[PDB]
Amino acid sequence: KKISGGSVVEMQGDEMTRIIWELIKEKLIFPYVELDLHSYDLGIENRDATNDQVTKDAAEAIKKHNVGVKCATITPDEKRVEEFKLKQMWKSPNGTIRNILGGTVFREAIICKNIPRLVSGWVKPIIIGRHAYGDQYRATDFVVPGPGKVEITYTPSDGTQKVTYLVHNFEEGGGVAMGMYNQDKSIEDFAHSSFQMALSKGWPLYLSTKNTILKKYDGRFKDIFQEIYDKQYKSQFEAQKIWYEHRLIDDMVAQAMKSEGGFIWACKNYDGDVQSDSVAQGYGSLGMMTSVLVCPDGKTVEAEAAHGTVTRHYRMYQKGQETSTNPIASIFAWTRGLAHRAKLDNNKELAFFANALEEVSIETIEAGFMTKDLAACIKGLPNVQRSDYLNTFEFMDKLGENLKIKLAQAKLSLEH
Amino acid sequence: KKISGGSVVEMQGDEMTRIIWELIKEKLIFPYVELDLHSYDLGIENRDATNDQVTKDAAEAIKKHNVGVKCATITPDEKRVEEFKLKQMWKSPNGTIRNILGGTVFREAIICKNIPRLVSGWVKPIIIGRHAYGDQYRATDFVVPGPGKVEITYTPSDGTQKVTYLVHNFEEGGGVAMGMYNQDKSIEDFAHSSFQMALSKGWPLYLSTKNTILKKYDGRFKDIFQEIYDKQYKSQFEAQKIWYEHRLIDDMVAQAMKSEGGFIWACKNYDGDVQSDSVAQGYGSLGMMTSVLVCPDGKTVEAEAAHGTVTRHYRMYQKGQETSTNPIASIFAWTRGLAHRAKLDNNKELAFFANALEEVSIETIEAGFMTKDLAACIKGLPNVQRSDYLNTFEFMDKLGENLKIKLAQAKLSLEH
Numbered sequence: 026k027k028i029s030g031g032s033v034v035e036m037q038g039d040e041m042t043r044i045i046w047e048l049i050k051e052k053l054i055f056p057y058v059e060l061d062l063h064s065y066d067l068g069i070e071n072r073d074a075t076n077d078q079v080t081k082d083a084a085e086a087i088k089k090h091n092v093g094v095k096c097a098t099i100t101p102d103e104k105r106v107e108e109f110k111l112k113q114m115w116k117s118p119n120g121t122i123r124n125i126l127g128g129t130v131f132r133e134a135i136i137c138k139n140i141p142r143l144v145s146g147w148v149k150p151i152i153i154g155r156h157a158y159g160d161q162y163r164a165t166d167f168v169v170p171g172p173g174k175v176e177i178t179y180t181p182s183d184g185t186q187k188v189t190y191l192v193h194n195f196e197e198g199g200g201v202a203m204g205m206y207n208q209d210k211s212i213e214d215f216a217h218s219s220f221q222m223a224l225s226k227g228w229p230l231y232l233s234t235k236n237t238i239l240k241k242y243d244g245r246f247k248d249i250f251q252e253i254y255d256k257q258y259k260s261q262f263e264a265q266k267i268w269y270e271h272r273l274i275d276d277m278v279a280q281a282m283k284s285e286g287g288f289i290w291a292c293k294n295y296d297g298d299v300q301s302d303s304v305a306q307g308y309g310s311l312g313m314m315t316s317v318l319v320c321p322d323g324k325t326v327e328a329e330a331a332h333g334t335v336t337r338h339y340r341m342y343q344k345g346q347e348t349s350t351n352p353i354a355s356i357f358a359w360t361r362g363l364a365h366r367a368k369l370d371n372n373k374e375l376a377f378f379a380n381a382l383e384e385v386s387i388e389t390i391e392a393g394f395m396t397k398d399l400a401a402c403i404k405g406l407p408n409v410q411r412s413d414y415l416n417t418f419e420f421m422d423k424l425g426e427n428l429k430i431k432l433a434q435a436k437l438s439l440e441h
Numbered sequence: 442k443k444i445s446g447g448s449v450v451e452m453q454g455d456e457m458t459r460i461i462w463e464l465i466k467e468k469l470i471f472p473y474v475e476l477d478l479h480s481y482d483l484g485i486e487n488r489d490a491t492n493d494q495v496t497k498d499a500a501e502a503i504k505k506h507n508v509g510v511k512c513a514t515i516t517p518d519e520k521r522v523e524e525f526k527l528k529q530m531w532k533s534p535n536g537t538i539r540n541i542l543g544g545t546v547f548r549e550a551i552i553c554k555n556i557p558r559l560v561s562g563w564v565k566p567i568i569i570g571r572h573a574y575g576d577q578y579r580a581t582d583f584v585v586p587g588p589g590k591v592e593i594t595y596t597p598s599d600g601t602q603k604v605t606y607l608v609h610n611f612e613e614g615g616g617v618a619m620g621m622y623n624q625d626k627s628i629e630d631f632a633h634s635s636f637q638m639a640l641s642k643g644w645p646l647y648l649s650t651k652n653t654i655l656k657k658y659d660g661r662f663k664d665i666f667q668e669i670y671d672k673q674y675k676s677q678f679e680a681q682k683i684w685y686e687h688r689l690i691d692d693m694v695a696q697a698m699k700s701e702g703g704f705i706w707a708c709k710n711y712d713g714d715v716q717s718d719s720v721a722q723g724y725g726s727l728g729m730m731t732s733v734l735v736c737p738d739g740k741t742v743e744a745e746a747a748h749g750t751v752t753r754h755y756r757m758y759q760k761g762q763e764t765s766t767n768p769i770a771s772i773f774a775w776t777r778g779l780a781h782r783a784k785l786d787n788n789k790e791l792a793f794f795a796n797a798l799e800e801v802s803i804e805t806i807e808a809g810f811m812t813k814d815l816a817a818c819i820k821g822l823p824n825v826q827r828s829d830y831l832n833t834f835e836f837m838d839k840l841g842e843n844l845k846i847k848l849a850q851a852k853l854s855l856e857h
């Protein structure tokens with residue numbers, strides 16, 4: 026009799042991560058846990074077949090069941106439209122889901138005692154709090170075909186003020202233009218999530234913007250964070266001997282680089298994307314990073330791997346060549362999802378299982394069994410030999426064996 | 442004798458950088474070089490007095506004389522408006538100048554063998570080619586006060602059509618919105634500058650975008666770079682055994698982090714700003730970096746010191762206290778400017794002088810003569826003693842002495 030897991034929304038994906046996703050369910054989840062699994066295939070072919078309706082339905086299912094576990098998916102471009110003979114260049118499924126759910130994507134490296142960093146000073150963790158709504162990820166962009174005016178207008182519903190601003194008057198040739206926005210309520214939830222995360226970890230909080238350039242747009246993020254801090258969190262930060270400060274983004278990335286870690290970094294959507302990949306790599310690998318969307322309701326989460334479909338690696342699998350893809354981030358999407366499901370259901374057995382799989386994953390790497398990427402952290406990529414790492418399947422087998430052992434010993438450890 | 446320098450546009454700046462800028466002219470340039478100097482004071486008080494007209498005039502002077510050297514300037518915020526009792530919160534002078542001139546700002550670290558990197562693998566240089574025009578630095582942003590529609594419109598100059606895109610319909614509360622653009626011709630010049638830089642250095646070229654998200658806006662940068670490569674540069678890259686690749690920005694930053702350097706990184710305006718500060722800091726010190734704007738005409742340049750005005754030291758200097766200000770980036774703005782002036786005028790003596798001052802600066806630090814910041818990079822700030830560094834004036838004197846020596850030995854080396 027397996028553990029009673031409960032209701033979980035799973036989103037199947039593409040390429041290398043799709044392969045890995047099936048191996049994880051079969052070898053690490055299904056032998057030990059029984060779930061009411063709400064499966065949505067977000068594979069590029071199924072999104073094309075359903076005119077991207079499957080993505081909207083999966084997002085609505087997460088709203089209802091409170092816990093999502095998502096596989097990395099292809100965001101189609103011109104080359105992808107050609108490859109899969111798509112009806113349209115479908116929008117990012119992550120963007121669709123995040124737009125519907127809202128919240129903050131909290132990203133952090135998965136640390137192993139034997140893995141060396143690329144950044145010497147990072148002795149404490151860096152938690153990135155990426156705002157999951159608006160800006161470039163819900164923008165309107167277009168090609169300007171030739172000379173003419175691009176204007177941006179605001180028309181109040183309950184006002185008079187049709188305000189028209191000239192963006193640019195193209196006098197010779199064309200180019201490109203775009204409009205983007207953000208919402209006060211979403212910014213307020215992002216500020217609250219950031220202050221709360223810093224207080225739960227007991228670390229200082231830094232918000233990065235470019236308010237010297239985008240005086241109104243970024244100035245608003247700065248003003249909302251400062252206002253919420255002064256009125257609702259300042260005394261709490263002072264009590265834990267921590268602080269909150271705004272920094273310019275270019276200063277912030279340089280500060281982070283020369284720091285020792287141990288802080289929460291509130292990032293605007295775009296910066297959170299870019300810098301989350303820099304922080305994961307700085308600590309060792311993109312395969313070694315947790316990614317959880319924490320919704321503003323405080324009950325709903327969508328767990329995923331911060332990295333993508335690992336297309337480069339999938340192209341090697343396609344050629345029947347050997348692959349060594351790190352499945353740890355994909356595994357931690359399941360464990361973080363199951364841990365949240367356990368917390369909602371007060372399921373001590375599911376919570377034990379979720380944590381045990383995380384320990385098994387870290388212990389296996391710490392025991393010297395790892396994928397090529399992690400072996401390159403220790404030895405340097407040119408000094409890496411076949412004997413130093415395990416392939417994708419080999420690594421999954423070792424994890425399955427170690428998981429079986431950890432769960433057997435835990436059961437035996439139970440006293441009368 | 443004195444080297445006939447020629448026509449150079451200089452832009453004076455603010456705080457500690459303004460002091461250091463003067464020490465440089467007096468001790469390192471004026472004793473050896475005679476210049477037709479076109480001086481524009483871009484200090485915050487003079488920009489206020491001229492309603493920022495001095496900035497536009499300096500930019501027009503650079504267009505005319507083809508070479509400009511710029512000191513670091515204050516971009517005023519609310520606290521700066523209060524401090525200097527400004528009439529307005531003046532726009533960034535760098536933004537104004539770059540908007541008028543156009544081109545690409547090439548950023549590269551200034552390497553000293555004895556200064557430790559924070560990024561272990563960077564054994565070869567990373568050259569960031571920052572597109573200097575448009576996007577966030579020529580944007581129109583505003584606060585949305587409440588419910589209502591934000592739209593962006595395009596009207597061709599013939600007035601025979603009008604395209605209206607909905608950016609967002611605010612239904613509850615307000616937020617923020619912005620319009621930004623770029624121009625095809627500016628993108629084309631950025632692509633050419635990037636391919637040419639890679640071919641002159643003999644390194645591969647990488648362009649970073651977020652074209653999976655901004656399909657039209659970033660897709661255009663991607664299409665223009667790919668088109669120009671295939672038609673005008675591919676055979677040249679193949680001949681030097683180098684390549685041109687497009688990567689997504691978040692992938693790119695992770696790639697750069699784990700690389701060994703030795704590539705050209707074509708960055709969009711914003712990414713260039715952020716990542717050049719991450720890279721400069723990764724090599725050792727933020728202020729150990731060159732920043733040269735190469736204009737599309739292939740004749741005009743603006744070299745600058747792309748760091749802050751060092752307020753913390755300026756305060757100490759005002760109080761008659763001891764300061765230890767790194768002047769290297771400000772020195773290299775002069776040497777890169779003078780080297781370009783020499784190249785335009787076929788002045789072998791000016792070219793020799795420009796290079797000699799660069800060698801002198803690197804050799805002095807490498808000989809163990811440096812400012813507090815660099816001493817902290819080697820020993821760590823708590824382990825730094827007064828004997829480990831030189832003050833602002835002491836460091837300038839050492840460079841002046843070493844420059845006098847290098848130039849005397851070079852004159853003696855001339856055969857009868």
Ligand SMILES: NC(=O)c1ccc[n+]([C@@H]2O[C@H](COP(=O)([O-])OP(=O)(O)OC[C@H]3O[C@@H](n4cnc5c(N)ncnc54)[C@H](OP(=O)(O)O)[C@@H]3O)[C@@H](O)[C@H]2O)c1
Nearest residue numbers: 097098099100311312332333334335336337351398689692
């Ligand atoms: N959450 C998501 O659904 C998500 C996120 C990002 C991207 N994407 C999509 O994924 C596709 C490919 O994206 P991308 O190549 O830009 O980004 P990516 O999949 O994160 O991978 C880029 C590179 O990072 C390394 N890497 C990433 N995950 C790894 C892992 N688990 N183990 C080892 N190495 C790993 C590899 O480096 P080396 O090649 O040097 O080994 C890989 O080629 C695109 O269609 C994109 O839209 C989706």
Ligand SMILES: *[C@H]1[C@@H](C#N)C(=O)[C@@H](C)[C@@H]2CCc3cn(C(=O)c4ccccc4)nc3[C@@]12c1ccccc1
Nearest residue numbers: 727728748751753754763764765766767813814817
């Ligand atoms: C300089 C110093 C002195 N004297 C001091 O006491 C600090 C307040 C100070 C902090 C900021 C700063 C910047 N620099 C630079 O010289 C510089 C110049 C150009 C680009 C980047 C940096 N020095 C300092 C001070 C410092 C910094 C670090 C360690 C010791 C002193």
Ligand SMILES: [Mg+2]
Nearest residue numbers: 298299302691
């Ligand atoms: Mg990303």
Ligand SMILES: [Mg+2]
Nearest residue numbers: 275714715718
């Ligand atoms: Mg900057």
